[PDB]
Nucleic acid binder design. Structure first.
Ligand SMILES: [Mg+2]
Ligand SMILES: [Mg+2]
Ligand SMILES: [Mg+2]
Ligand SMILES: [Mg+2]
Ligand SMILES: [Mg+2]
Ligand SMILES: [Mg+2]
Ligand SMILES: [Mg+2]
Ligand SMILES: [Mg+2]
Ligand SMILES: [Mg+2]
Ligand SMILES: [Mg+2]
Ligand SMILES: [Mg+2]
Ligand SMILES: [Mg+2]
Ligand SMILES: [Mg+2]
Ligand SMILES: [Mg+2]
Ligand SMILES: [Mg+2]
Ligand SMILES: [Mg+2]
Ligand SMILES: [Mg+2]
Ligand SMILES: [Mg+2]
Ligand SMILES: [Mg+2]
Ligand SMILES: [Mg+2]
Lengths: 143, 145, 78, 58, 206, 67, 55, 141, 64
RNA sequence: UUAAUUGCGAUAACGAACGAGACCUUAACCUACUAAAUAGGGUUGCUGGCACUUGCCGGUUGACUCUUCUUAGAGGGACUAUCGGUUUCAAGCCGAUGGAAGUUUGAGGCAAUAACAGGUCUGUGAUGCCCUUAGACGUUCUGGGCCGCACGCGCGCUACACUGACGGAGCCAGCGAGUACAACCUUGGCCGAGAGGUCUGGGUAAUCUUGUGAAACUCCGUCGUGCUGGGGAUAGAGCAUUGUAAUUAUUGCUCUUCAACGAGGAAUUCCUAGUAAGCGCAAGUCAUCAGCUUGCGUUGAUUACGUCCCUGCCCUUUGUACACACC
C-alpha cells in the first residue's frame, strides 16, 4: 500500500535522497562549498568533500516534510552540536546560516519547498510527491 | 577495495619546502607537519589540488607534490579566499600572505623585534618573557618548564 | 615526555604483494576476523585493516555475524 | 515568582541560601453576554488582593 | 512459523515463535545452568528478558541485587569511569558485541560462558583488617556468595577495562577474551589471576 | 520509626473511653467516626488517630488491656 | 564645579547606574522584576512585599 | 461509533498517549510504525508487550501513540507502558474479564512497570553542593 | 588435594570485627546435617546461603 | 523501643510549657467532579500526496463534540492496611501480599534554653563614643590599581584518549525570563564563511522567542596506540559586537604555532537511589564578559542496609589537684 516518509528509516531515506539528488544535475551547489566548516561548532569541513551538500539538502527536505514549517534559524538550531571551546565548558553553537539559506533556496528552485504564509518554508505538493516516491524506492529497495 | 600499491614506488620520506616529512601518514596530516600549515589549511590545499583526500603522502606522484607546493605558496591565485589565510593585511606592505615553515618563524621574529624596538607595552612584555594577552600571573605560569 | 615504550613502526602502512598472498592465505583458518584480530598479526596498519576487512566481502570468503560500526564480527565461511 | 538570596549580610558563615516566592493565579473568563449587566458585574464584588481586568475584545 | 497478518508488518523473525524469549533474540536462557550449587539463587538466568536493559528498583531493599539479571549486572558494571559513567546504551551494545564474539569462539552458548566465568573468577576465601594498629595484619575469613558474584563481576570488568585501555582491541573483544579465559581456569585471565592470588594470600594469613 | 507520639495515643484513648459502643473493627468506618465525633484539624493526624484507635480496639477485642 | 565637568561622566549603565531604592547602595542589588532593592533589605521586607519562605 | 479508548504511560518526564481502536493491526508511534522507534537497541523493549501477549491477540486492533517529553529511553519506556495499558484497558472495556486478567498475568509477571508507572522522580537540588544530595568540598587548612 | 566443602547457614550470630563489616554465622554441612561449625563471613548473608570452605576443622573466633 | 526527653512502663513524684512530632511547600496517584480557541483529542468539513477498497501520513484559527494526557480548584488517598513471625506479649521491630505510595513515602521550610568577646560600623538616613569637617577622611572630574610576579596553599574547568577524537545523519526535556517612559526575548525574509549585519513581524506572556529541534546519546564512515586527527595552553595576523572609552589582549569569529600532560606520593574530599557521576539549559551577576552560584531536566550505576576501629555527637556511671574548664 501507499507509503510516506514516516514509514522508512531516517538514515537510509536521507542517504538515498542524497544519492538521487547527486545523480541528477539539478540542485546547484553554492560555489563556496569545499570551503566552509558548516558551523562554528565544527573544526573541520565535512569528511565527504563533495556530495555532503546533497546529504544536507536531503535531511532538510525530510525535516520540512515531517514538521510544520521550518525557517533558517530553526535549522541553525537543529544542526550544530557542541564546540570544543579550548579549555572552557562546551556549549551549544548554532549552525552556519548561509549554508542552510542556500539549501532552502536550492530546494525552492527544485520546487520541493514552498514559502509558507506563517513564515518559514513548508513542503510543496510536487516535492512531497517526489519524497514519497523515493521513500517507496528505498522501501522496495530493502526487500 | 584494496591494491598491491606497486611495490617499489611508494615513497617513505619526502622533502617538501625544505622540511623532512614522513609520507606514510595521510596526505593532509602529513602536510600538517610543516610549520604554518594546520589540518584545516592542509585539507583545503589538498582539496584544491584535486589529489585524493584518503590517499597516502608517500604514494602520490611528483607533479602532484609540485602542484600542491605551488598552490600553498600563492593561495589567492587558486581561489583560496582573502580570509582563511595565515597572515592577512600584512602590516609591512598590506598584501595578505601566508607564512610557511621558515618564513613563519622568521617573520614572527621580525614582528617580535619590531614590538621590542617600538617600545610598546606588549613589546617589552614579550622581551621580558611574561604573559602578554592580559592573564593573571600570581598563579599562572609559575614554572618555566 | 617519556621514552619507555620504545615502539617501532610495527604496522604495514601500505599493503605489499607478499602480504596480500598472506592475508588471502589466512583469510580462512582465522575462525574469527576483526580489525584488532587482523592487526594483531603485524601485517595491517589499522586503517587498511578496514580496507582488507571490507574487501573480503567479495566472493563470500567470510560471513558477517554483525556489521555494527566501530568494529566488525566475521566468521570463516563454511 | 522566585528569588534566591544569601542569608548572610556580610558573606561570613557557612554557605546558606533561601528562596522567597509568590504564586500568581490568573483564571481568565470570557462571556458571550449583554452589555450593561456584564459591566455592572465588573464594578461589583471586588476584594483587595485579587485584581480584576476587563477586555471588551469586540 | 504462522506469521500474523497486521496493518503494521513486524519482521518475521520477531514474529516466529515468540514464546521462546531470547536475550538478544539470539541466545536461549534455557540450556543455561549454574554448575556450582553455592552461587545458585544469586545468578538470575532463570527469568527471561528481551533486552539487557531494565529500569528496575534493584537497590531499594537489601538483597534484590540478586534478582537483577546477571547480564544486566555485567552491563551496569561495565559503565564504570568518570568519562563514561551514565552511558548504559553503550554498555548494552558492548555486552551484545561480546556475546556475539563469544558465540563465534567456541560456540558454547555465550550465556553459559558468562555464568561459568563468573563461577570461576569469584574468590571463595578472603581477608579482613583485624590488626590492632601496632600488630596490623590481614585475617582469613569466608565470603558471602552474593559478594562472590559481585567480586567476580568486578574483576572481570576491571580486567576488560585495563585490557582495552590505550590498546588496539575494542572493549567488547577484551571483555570476550576475559570471559572466555575465565570460563576455564586459564591463569592468563586477569580476574582469575587476582582470584588465585587473593585466595593464596588468605591461605597465608589463616 | 513510627511511634505515634502523645497526641494520637491520648486522643485514641479518650475516643475509646467515650465511644466504645460506636467504634468498630474497620479502619474506614472508624475514620469516618473520627471525622464526625472529633474535630481533628488536619487529615494526616486524623488517619493516624483512626489507625491507633483501630489497633487499640483490636487489642481490646483480643482481651482486656491496661490503661 | 563647572557644569561641563561636575557629574559629567555618563551613568547610563554599569554598577553605579542604578541604586538600592532603600539604601542608595550599589552592592548586592536585586534587579529581578524591577525590585531594585538590595539583598538584605529584600530579606527584611519580603513578607511585606509578598515573598515568603515556602520550600 | 468505533470502539476505542485512550490511555497513557509515563516516565520521569516522558508521556506517551495511546489511542486504541478496533483496526487492522496498525501500530504507529508519532505517525511512524513501531519498528522504527527513535533509538534501535531498546526496540525490543517496545515490542515487549507485543511478544509477551502475542500479536494475534490484537490483529484487528490499531494503535496510535504520541510520545512527548523526556529523553529517548524515557520516551521508549513511556510507549511501552502506554501500549500495555491501552491493551489492558481496551480488553476490560469491550472484550471480556478473563482476557484482561490473562493479559495482566502475562504482564505483571514480567517487569511490573509495564502496567504500573514508575515511582522514582528526580530529587530537588540544595545549596552547598553541585548535586541533589552532594556537597562541594572541605579545605580544613 | 581439593577438599572444597559446602555449608548452608542455619542462623546468623550478629556482625563482628573491628571494622564492623564482617559477620558470624552458624553453618551446617550439606552432608551429615547434624554436624555444624561457627564461621566468619565477609559479605552480606542471610538464612539460606551456601558458603564454600576450604577448611573444616576451623571454628570462628570473635575478631577484635 | 524510637530518627527523637519517641513511647511502653517503673516510680517522690503530680501535673504542665518550649523543642521533636504535629504543621506548610513540593513530588508522586486520581480514566471520580468542575471546566478550557492562552492546552490537548475525536468525528466531520475544505484540501496535499501515496495507495488504489473502503486506507495510510499530512495541511485548515471551517464546524460539532470530549477532557485520557496539559492545566488548577474543591476533594479522595496511607493510617504500617491485611496476614505471618518476634516482643515484660505492651511500646514496638522483621517479612510477604494488596497498593501509587510501606526509609517519618521521598526533598525540604520553620526549628528550643544557654552561649561565642565567632562575622558584619564595608547593607542601612540603624548607631554610642572617638577622629575629620575646607588645599576635607565630604562630593565630583581625569588617569592608574584592585589582574603585577623569584614563590606556597584552597574551590574548580579542560584533559591525558579506542567505553575515543573527527565528519555527516538521527532529534529528546524541565525549571525560567523577556520592552515605558524605554529601548527587552527574538521568529521569519535577505546578506556574510562566522561572529555578525539589515528589513520586517509577533510577545507586557500556557498566545510570540518556544515543542527553547540543548549536549551527553544513537546510526553510518575517516582515523589506528603514533604525545597521534588526543590535549588546546602560550602567541602572530585579520574580521566584528557592547561600550564615551576595550592598550594591560572586554567578548565572539577565521588561519597558524601547537606546549605541559603517559591515570598522578604523602595525604585528603563528597556520596547508599532517579543517589553519586557524566551531560547540558535557564535564572542571579549583565551595556559586553563566565570556567561561579542558585535551580532544572537528560543518560544513569558499583557497593552497603553495618560498626564504634579513626574523627566526633547524645545519655548514664566514675575519677579529677581542671572552671580563662586538657589548647
Ligand atoms: Mg548534529
Ligand atoms: Mg558525534
Ligand atoms: Mg573533549
Ligand atoms: Mg565531557
Ligand atoms: Mg549531579
Ligand atoms: Mg483528568
Ligand atoms: Mg502482628
Ligand atoms: Mg521530612
Ligand atoms: Mg561611620
Ligand atoms: Mg569618599
Ligand atoms: Mg581581588
Ligand atoms: Mg567554597
Ligand atoms: Mg582534537
Ligand atoms: Mg520543553
Ligand atoms: Mg541539538
Ligand atoms: Mg596534536
Ligand atoms: Mg562570584
Ligand atoms: Mg547508616
Ligand atoms: Mg581553680
Ligand atoms: Mg598537656
Amino acid at each position: 500500500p501507499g507509503v510516506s516518509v514516516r514509514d522508512v528509516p531516517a538514515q537510509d531515506f536521507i542517504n538515498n535522497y542524497a544519492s538521487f539528488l547527486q545523480r541528477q544535475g539539478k540542485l546547484e551547489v553554492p560555489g563556496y562549498v569545499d570551503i566552509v566548516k558548516t558551523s562554528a561548532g565544527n573544526e573541520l569541513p565535512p569528511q565527504d568533500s563533495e556530495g555532503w551538500f546533497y546529504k544536507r539538502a536531503a535531511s532538510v527536505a525530510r525535516h520540512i516534510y515531517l514538521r510544520k514549517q521550518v525557517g533558517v534559524g530553526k535549522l541553525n538550531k537543529l544542526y550544530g552540536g557542541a564546540k570544543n571551546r579550548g579549555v572552557r565548558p562546551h556549549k551549544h553553537v548554532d549552525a552556519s546560516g548561509s549554508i542552510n539559506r542556500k539549501v532552502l533556496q536550492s530546494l525552492e528552485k527544485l520546487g520541493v519547498v514552498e514559502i509558507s504564509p506563517k513564515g518559514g518554508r513548508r513542503i510543496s505538493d510536487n516535492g512531497l510527491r517526489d519524497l514519497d516516491r523515493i521513500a517507496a524506492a528505498t522501501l522496495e529497495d530493502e526487500e | 577495495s584494496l591494491v598491491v600499491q606497486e611495490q617499489g614506488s611508494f615513497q617513505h620520506i619526502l622533502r617538501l619546502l625544505n622540511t623532512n616529512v614522513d609520507g606514510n601518514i595521510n596526505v593532509v596530516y602529513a602536510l600538517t607537519t610543516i610549520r604554518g600549515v594546520g589540518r584545516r589549511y592542509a585539507n583545503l590545499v589538498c582539496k584544491k589540488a584535486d589529489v585524493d583526500l584518503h590517499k597516502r603522502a608517500g604514494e602520490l606522484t611528483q607533479e602532484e607534490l609540485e602542484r600542491i607546493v605551488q598552490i600553498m605558496q600563492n593561495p589567492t591565485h587558486y581561489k583560496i579566499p582573502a580570509w582563511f589565510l595565515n597572515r592577512q593585511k600584512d602590516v609591512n606592505d598590506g598584501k595578505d600572505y601566508h607564512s610557511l615553515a621558515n618564513n613563519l618563524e622568521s617573520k614572527l621574529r621580525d614582528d617580535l623585534e619590531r614590538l621590542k624596538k617600538i617600545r610598546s607595552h606588549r613589546g617589552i612584555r614579550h622581551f621580558w618573557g611574561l604573559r602578554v594577552r592580559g592573564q593573571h600571573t600570581k598563579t599562572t605560569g609559575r614554572r618555566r618548564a | 615526555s617519556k621514552k619507555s615504550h620504545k615502539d617501532k613502526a610495527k604496522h604495514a602502512v601500505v599493503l605489499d604483494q607478499d602480504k596480500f598472498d598472506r592475508i588471502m592465505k589466512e583469510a580462512p583458518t582465522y575462525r574469527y576476523v576483526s580489525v584488532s584480530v587482523l592487526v594483531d598479526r603485524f601485517k595491517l596498519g589499522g586503517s587498511l585493516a578496514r580496507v582488507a576487512l571490507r574487501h573480503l566481502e567479495n566472493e563470500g570468503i567470510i560471513k558477517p555475524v554483525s556489521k555494527h560500526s566501530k568494529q566488525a564480527i566475521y566468521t570463516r565461511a563454511t | 515568582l522566585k528569588i534566591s538570596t544569601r542569608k548572610t549580610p556580610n558573606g561570613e558563615g557557612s554557605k546558606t541560601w533561601d528562596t522567597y516566592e509568590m504564586r500568581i493565579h490568573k483564571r481568565y473568563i470570557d462571556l458571550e453576554a449583554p452589555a450593561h449587566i456584564v459591566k455592572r458585574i465588573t464594578q461589583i464584588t471586588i476584594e483587595p488582593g485579587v485584581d480584576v481586568e476587563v477586555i471588551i475584545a469586540a | 512459523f504462522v506469521p500474523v497478518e497486521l496493518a503494521t508488518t513486524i519482521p518475521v523473525e520477531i514474529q516466529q515463535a515468540q514464546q521462546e524469549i531470547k536475550l538478544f533474540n539470539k541466545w536461549s536462557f534455557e540450556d543455561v545452568e549454574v554448575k556450582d550449587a553455592s552461587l545458585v539463587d544469586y545468578i538470575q538466568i532463570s527469568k527471561p528478558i528481551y533486552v539487557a536493559h531494565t529500569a528496575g528498583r534493584y537497590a531499594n531493599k537489601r538483597f534484590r541485587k540478586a534478582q537483577c539479571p546477571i547480564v544486566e549486572r555485567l552491563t551496569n558494571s561495565l559503565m564504570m569511569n568518570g568519562r563514561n559513567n551514565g552511558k548504559k546504551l553503550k554498555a548494552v551494545r558492548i555486552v551484545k558485541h561480546t556475546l556475539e564474539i563469544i558465540n563465534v569462539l567456541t560456540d558454547q552458548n555465550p550465556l553459559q560462558v558468562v555464568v561459568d566465568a563468573i563461577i570461576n573468577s569469584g574468590p571463595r576465601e578472603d581477608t579482613t583488617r583485624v590488626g590492632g594498629g601496632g600488630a596490623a595484619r590481614r585475617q582469613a575469613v569466608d565470603v558471602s556468595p552474593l559478594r562472590r558474584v559481585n567480586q567476580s563481576i568486578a574483576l572481570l570488568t576491571i580486567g576488560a577495562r585495563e585490557a582495552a585501555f590505550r590498546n588496539i582491541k575494542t572493549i567488547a573483544e577484551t571483555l570476550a577474551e576475559e570471559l572466555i579465559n575465565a570460563a576455564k581456569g586459564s591463569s592468563t585471565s586477569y580476574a582469575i589471576k587476582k582470584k588465585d592470588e587473593l585466595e593464596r594470600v588468605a591461605k597465608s594469613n589463616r | 520509626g513510627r511511634v505515634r507520639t502523645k497526641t494520637v495515643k491520648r486522643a485514641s484513648k479518650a475516643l475509646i473511653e467515650k465511644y466504645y459502643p460506636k467504634l468498630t473493627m474497620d479502619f474506614q468506618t472508624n475514620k469516618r467516626l473520627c471525622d464526625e465525633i472529633a474535630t481533628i484539624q488536619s487529615k494526616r493526624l486524623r488517619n493516624k488517630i483512626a489507625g491507633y484507635t483501630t489497633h487499640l480496639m483490636k487489642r481490646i477485642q483480643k482481651g482486656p488491656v491496661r490503661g | 564645579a563647572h557644569e561641563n565637568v561636575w557629574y559629567s561622566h555618563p551613568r547610563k549603565f554599569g554598577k553605579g547606574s542604578r541604586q538600592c531604592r532603600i539604601s542608595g547602595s550599589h552592592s548586592g542589588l536585586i534587579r529581578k522584576y524591577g525590585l531594585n532593592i538590595d539583598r538584605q533589605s529584600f530579606r527584611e521586607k519580603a513578607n511585606d512585599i509578598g515573598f515568603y519562605k515556602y520550600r | 461509533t468505533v470502539p476505542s479508548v485512550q490511555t497513557f504511560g509515563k516516565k520521569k518526564s516522558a508521556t506517551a498517549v495511546a489511542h486504541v481502536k478496533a483496526g487492522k493491526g496498525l501500530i504507529k508511534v508519532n505517525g511512524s510504525p513501531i519498528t522504527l522507534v527513535q533509538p534501535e537497541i531498546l526496540r525490543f523493549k517496545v515490542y515487549e508487550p507485543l511478544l509477551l501477549v502475542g500479536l494475534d491477540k490484537f490483529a484487528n486492533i490499531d494503535i496510535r501513540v504520541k510520545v512527548t517529553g523526556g529523553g529517548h529511553v524515557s520516551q521508549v519506556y513511556a510507549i511501552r507502558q502506554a501500549i500495555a495499558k491501552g491493551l489492558v484497558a481496551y480488553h476490560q472495556k469491550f472484550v471480556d474479564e478473563q482476557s484482561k486478567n490473562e493479559l495482566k498475568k502475562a504482564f505483571t509477571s514480567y517487569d511490573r512497570t509495564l502496567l504500573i508507572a514508575d515511582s522514582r522522580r528526580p530529587e530537588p537540588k540544595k545549596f552547598g553542593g553541585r548535586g541533589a544530595r552532594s556537597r562541594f568540598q572541605k579545605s580544613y587548612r | 588435594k581439593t577438599p572444597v566443602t559446602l555449608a548452608k547457614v542455619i542462623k546468623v550470630l550478629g556482625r563482628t570485627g573491628s571494622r564492623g563489616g564482617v559477620t558470624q554465622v552458624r553453618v551446617e554441612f550439606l552432608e551429615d546435617t547434624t554436624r555444624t561449625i561457627v564461621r566468619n563471613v565477609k559479605g552480606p548473608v542471610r538464612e539460606g546461603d551456601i558458603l564454600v570452605l576450604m577448611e573444616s576443622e576451623r571454628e570462628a573466633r570473635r575478631l577484635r
